[PDB]
Design a protein around this ligand. Structure first.
Ligand SMILES: CCCCCC[C@@H]1NC[C@@H](O)[C@H](O)[C@H]1C(=O)O
Ligand SMILES: CCCCCC[C@@H]1NC[C@@H](O)[C@H](O)[C@H]1C(=O)O
Lengths: 597, 597
């Protein structure tokens, strides 16, 4: 049971603020020598939140595999003698184990979701405790995402993985201590139903030794509904709906009264209905059309570290270009992202970190498990770890009205028997963990309409298609034919709504061509344009998401010229020519509505 | 009297073909030691045609001022015992003096026009003579263009000049030996009149001890007119006219019969009428609208050297983009250019090399004659040299139907009294040297409508305007207002047709901006677009020529990031985004007709 921290009977002191002591451990003696005991040797200042790889311009820190130590002292605020205090890590990429002054208090696997522990017994209010963090950036076959650690003859660990983006690690987001009353709200769940768009209710179901009443206050803070019951309610309402263009928010505030002290938790709600009918995706009983991007949490110097200016600027760009939706590509994003999405009515495809369950999308000319689904590779523990990743993503983003669909994985290889054996239970478990949202699994190119094995276990079909790029390279005529043929094949086979969640081409900013050859800005424009002409001719396609909003870092190889260049913007957010192409189509269309051509 | 070499009683052996011996002369002892006597010492292979500056990747050859020696042996063809043979240099940039085996035979000042000498007495037919050329790249106040040589304390000559483009030198074009019969055509002049577009004649006037008859053969080689008379004729005709879109060519062939031997010269003619009426420029009695470029003869490695692939490719680009006209910016171009223009119906503004008669367009923070028009600077000899440059340009391109206007100079400073004193006689002398074409002088920005002194001495007003770039920098709103105000002021003051012969902005390929700030591709697009919206609101503007077709080399300075970047194409001919902007406007308009907005 987890909620995002906020105010009044609750209060934060964040240690996000500032520089920590940081150290490597090339021989992994930190645990043996109990480094959490003393203040570190060999410590250098590092900034949190932020990846550790790019911060020191050193290829050895950058390419490190192992454990790293983050440590900082802090003064525990003194008006906190009688309240309950928690230590919350909003993300520690891959694995983290924390000591609060010689006392292990938490441990976590999963680099993208928050994890907290009550630390009341282990701290002296009014004085300073020392926080030590042990961070592991290693991936094996039971981590979400999977990878393999390669140890050379000399014990240097080098991490290989099967996804594009670079394996940035560290404390990527918020680290804070926050206090709730000893009687406190611990979890909230809100569900919205709507009929003729002027007439429904907000079911609730709450959970910590406190009798609870909930007021549903206005944007004007005018109250229009009231309930009581730990097992919640159905507050019935005639309302203004949370819509894609505007995203209205009521405020449902839950009051947890114990007979002495009280706690109250403010939770914003968007009144909207999501469903799939035939080949139509409907938000509030109207067929929506998705436009926008796959994104990444990547940026210069800070890696995957959260940054407010970046969020403000990237939403300004996305707003300008006319995007209405995005997918949290290949891991759960910072919650600040989803909060922004709620206030602005941005439609979001929420996705777990389950990427790389595929051993066919390689560079060439170089020792893998020859069976993807097996005891050596993706096995039962992997499945359990995956289900737990689904449970953490859902427990954190269930109430967000902007999250409109759950993505279980991205681009697994579905051809082997055992893909369906691995995925079907996860598809079912996910539906039972949130029956109010449709479910998806993003589908790779070579698992075509004929060969794919699991897409009928999901509500929406999300395709990643690169005809004319990785195959039929340079050939816009042939690729157009292939793309039309496979889209009609998919619509014939499943009669589900189709979103093209990935389509894009590597483009060097400033490379121009009078031909329309690959890597050129002219080719990025003509290729996106040919895709758009096809989408507009297939009734089932309800959504387009250009593969990347910006250029991002990847591991080194012959396929990646300083990373992935499929961005519409450069890594410093400057637009390639295709940006204006996109802006013309996406602002020239009626909002949320499929282009009539 | 000069004509371009061609065939049958005439025949070429070109020494353009191939590598010559080349040498510097840092102490100028080549003339004293009569290097033309022997085969050179210290000689390295060099390619002709082509500048010498960029060919060796050496900054000292590149930045040299002085004399250089070109020398090659050649075998004089033996079936040339009884015909007359000439040595023709199509261009030797700035100055050249040639010895044909210890016999000075020619000398020339003027780096852009051909010069030839009969060499019959000085050669043994059937054996090989040695050709030595002395080339000077220096500019003083009596050269077209003017410059000043700066000699430092150690006698190193460094050339300063007052124009943008780099002072490339050498043998830039064709060097050939060609034979005519001892009775030969020596000069031709053709004039075209046309009334209701189905009804007029071709006046002629011919000139070398030969009785002459002229047949006017078809594209089908069908004869439709015939004359005789050294003093020519008026062949009256009902015809298909030389038009801008197509450029039909008759062939007028002149037959020079002596009683024994004969010579005949083929000369293509375009039947078209050019005139100015009010604020209208008419080709064949219809108002034309100019689109296209200022160009340059500049390209990688070869400098200003002529190259056939470059001509084919640049015309393919210009054709694609929709350009119908161009100005031979800042010197006469290769005649092959004007021949191409004739066959393709490209309208050309022909311009002399008289650039830099202005000492106000400088970079800053650095000794010039404080009076531009004076004995120290532009004086009477400069005027005579300028008139001779006008005479050479006109004698070479008079018959070309594509040449539709003569440009006397580019961007002189007209404010001082003495600008009108210098220019008026040249304007008159030019009208009397070709009364069939309108006359222009390209006008610089700071000689505004109020202050300019000489524009009323010319038929067409050609403006070079850079509001929003060099002034009101970045400000599209303010610059738009200024540009409209000055264009209406010019139309009010002179009621002449206005061509904007220069408008452009420096643009780094691949620099992009979400603002529309300078040096960005987005700014090049928005600035050209604002100019186009203004032009379309002023009745007198009949022509637009974006300043540069491609990026070109300039001398070093703080204003030029690796040269001038105002090109629409890069120096390797790849398009910036604005190229598509241009292609949309220029191909979306009715041909030769002003955009109705
Ligand atoms: C032949 C199949 C090619 C799959 C390649 C498409 C990949 N999908 C997942 C994304 O994270 C990658 O960046 C994308 C790519 O490589 O740019
Ligand atoms: C303030 C007046 C500025 C004049 C500058 C305009 C110049 N006209 C002549 C061209 O040869 C130059 O390239 C152009 C420029 O500099 O790019």
């Amino acid at each position: 049971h987890m909620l995002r921290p906020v105010e009044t009977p609750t209060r934060e002191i964040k240690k996000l603020d500032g520089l920590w002591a940081f150290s490597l451990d090339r021989e992994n003696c930190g645990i043996d020598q109990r480094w959490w005991e003393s203040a570190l040797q060999e410590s250098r200042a590092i900034a949190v939140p932020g990846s550790f790889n790019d911060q020191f311009a050193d290829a050895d820190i950058r390419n490190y595999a192992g454990n790293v130590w983050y440590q900082r002292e802090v003064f525990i605020p003194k008006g906190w003698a009688g309240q309950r205090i928690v230590l919350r890590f909003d993300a520690v990429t891959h694995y983290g184990k924390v000591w609060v002054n010689n006392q292990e208090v938490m441990e976590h696997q999963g680099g993208y979701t928050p994890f907290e522990a009550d630390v009341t017994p282990y701290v002296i209010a009014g004085k300073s405790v020392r926080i030590t963090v042990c961070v592991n950036n290693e991936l094996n076959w039971q981590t979400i995402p999977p990878g393999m650690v390669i140890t050379d003859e000399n014990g240097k660990k080098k991490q290989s993985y099967f996804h594009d983006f670079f394996n940035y690690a560290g404390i990527h987001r918020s680290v804070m201590l926050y206090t709730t009353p000893n009687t406190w709200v611990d979890d909230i769940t809100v569900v919205t139903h709507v009929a003729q768009d002027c007439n429904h209710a907000s079911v609730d179901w709450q959970v910590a030794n406190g009798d609870v009443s909930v007021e549903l206050r206005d944007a004007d803070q005018q109250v229009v509904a009231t309930g009581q019951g730990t097992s919640g309610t159905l507050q019935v309402v005639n309302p203004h709906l949370w819509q894609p263009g505007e995203g209205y928010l009521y405020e449902l505030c839950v009051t947890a009264k114990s007979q002495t002290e009280c706690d109250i938790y403010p939770l914003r709600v968007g009144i909207r209905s999501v469903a799939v009918k035939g080949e139509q995706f409907l938000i509030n009983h109207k067929p929506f059309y998705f436009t926008g991007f796959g994104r990444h949490e990547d940026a210069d110097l800070r890696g995957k570290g959260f940054d407010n200016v970046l969020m403000v600027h990237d939403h300004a760009l996305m707003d300008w270009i006319g995007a209405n939706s995005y997918r949290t590509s290949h891991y759960p994003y910072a919650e600040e992202m989803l909060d922004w999405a709620d206030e602005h009515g941005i439609v979001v495809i929420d996705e777990t970190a389950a990427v790389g369950f595929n051993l066919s999308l390689g560079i060439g000319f170089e020792n893998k498990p020859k069976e993807l689904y097996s005891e050596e590779a993706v096995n039962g523990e992997t499945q359990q770890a995956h289900l737990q990743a689904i449970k953490e993503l859902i427990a954190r983003d269930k109430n967000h009205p902007s999250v409109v669909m759950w993505s279980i994985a991205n681009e697994p290889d579905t051809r082997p028997q055992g893909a369906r054996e691995y995925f079907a239970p996860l598809a079912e478990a996910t539906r039972k963990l949130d029956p109010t949202r449709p479910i998806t699994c993003v589908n790779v190119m070579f698992c075509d309409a004929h060969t794919d094995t699991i897409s009928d276990l999901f509500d929406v079909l999300c395709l990643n298609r690169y005809y004319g790029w990785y195959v039929q390279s340079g050939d816009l005529e042939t690729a157009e034919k292939v793309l039309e043929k496979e889209l009609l094949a998919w619509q014939e086979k499943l009669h589900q709504p189709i979103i093209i969640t990935e389509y894009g081409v590597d483009t060097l900013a400033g490379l121009h061509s009078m031909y329309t050859d690959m890597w050129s800005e002219e080719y990025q424009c003509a290729w996106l344009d040919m895709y758009h002409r096809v989408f507009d001719r297939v009734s089932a396609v309800v959504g387009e998401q250009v593969w990347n909003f910006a250029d991002f870092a990847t591991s080194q190889g012959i396929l990646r010229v300083g990373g992935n260049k499929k961005g519409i913007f450069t890594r410093d957010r400057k637009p390639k020519s295709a940006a204006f192409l996109l802006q013309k189509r996406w602002t020239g269309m009626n909002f949320g509505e499929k282009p009539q051509q």
